[PDB]
């Protein structure tokens, strides 16, 4: 999404349930691999936040 082509919006968004596995990105998808600071990238698929 190119809507947030600025710095003031911030999109003010919240997620209710995110149960998308990390390995699903290999199903012919062209999405860049997630990079996480302070925690290993796979922690999204392992633990809760």
């Amino acid at each position: 999404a190119t809507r947030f082509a600025s710095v003031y919006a911030w999109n003010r968004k919240r997620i209710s349930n995110c149960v998308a596995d990390y390995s699903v990105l290999y199903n012919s998808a062209s999405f860049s691999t997630f990079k996480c600071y302070g925690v290993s990238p796979t922690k999204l698929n392992d633990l809760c936040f």
Partner: nanobody
Amino acid sequence: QVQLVESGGGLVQAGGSLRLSCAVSGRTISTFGMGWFRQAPGKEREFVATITRDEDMLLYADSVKGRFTISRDTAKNMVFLQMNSLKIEDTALYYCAVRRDSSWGYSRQSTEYDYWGQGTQVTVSS
């Protein structure tokens, strides 16, 4: 100015294999997170690869995706980067992962690390 010391350097045979390990101990990569990056001739910065604690998937750089490999050991407490199928274009200074500001994490961006001190000069030619 002082320059970072890394294993290797000098002329490297094309298509060979070499190891890249940091030698300095004042600012180890572990403090800022294990990783490696190289500066191409001029003022261009790029990322090569890094090893994640999971050990199941390694963050690969699109430029060298599927080329470089990293070995892992339980008690060595060190990370060694191994290069495969070297090319003439690989000629570039190699730097140890260091950040100008305090931070910790894993990432796959070219501008992840940068420092004033120059790195080991590696020349690759046929």
